[PDB]
Amino acid sequence: ADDIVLKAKNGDVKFPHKAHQKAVPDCKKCHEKGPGKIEGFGKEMAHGKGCKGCHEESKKGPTKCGECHKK
């Protein structure tokens, strides 16, 4: 499958799967979540535990605006 880009108005956000599969061997951090996670994602989740928050706790991954968002 292909990577996906989230069309954030301030700048597209790329999600590179290969890096995550390698760096987050606990697959259940993202997969086999109960229903609702597709509908549930948004800016609140992205800037929280959905993206940025995991990067902050992991001590690795982009945490600055322009490291995720890029026109």
Ligand X SMILES: C[C@H](CCC(=O)O)[C@H]1CC[C@H]2[C@@H]3CC[C@@H]4C[C@H](O)CC[C@]4(C)[C@H]3C[C@H](O)[C@]12C
**Dihedrals φ, ψ of 5, to 5°?**
-120, 130
Which listed option, ligand X, ligand HEC, none, makes contact with residue 38 (CB within 5 to 8 Å by class)?
ligand X
Site for ligand HEC in 10-29 (CB under 6 A): 10, 13-17, 19-21, 23-25, 27, 29
Residue 51 labeled ligand binder = yes
Q: Up-side HSE of residue 52: CA atoms within 13 Å toward CB?
A: 16
Whole-angstrom Cα distance, residue 11 to residue 66? 9
Q: How far is the CB of 39 from ligand HEC (least distance, A)?
A: 11
Annotated binding site for deoxycholate: 37, 49
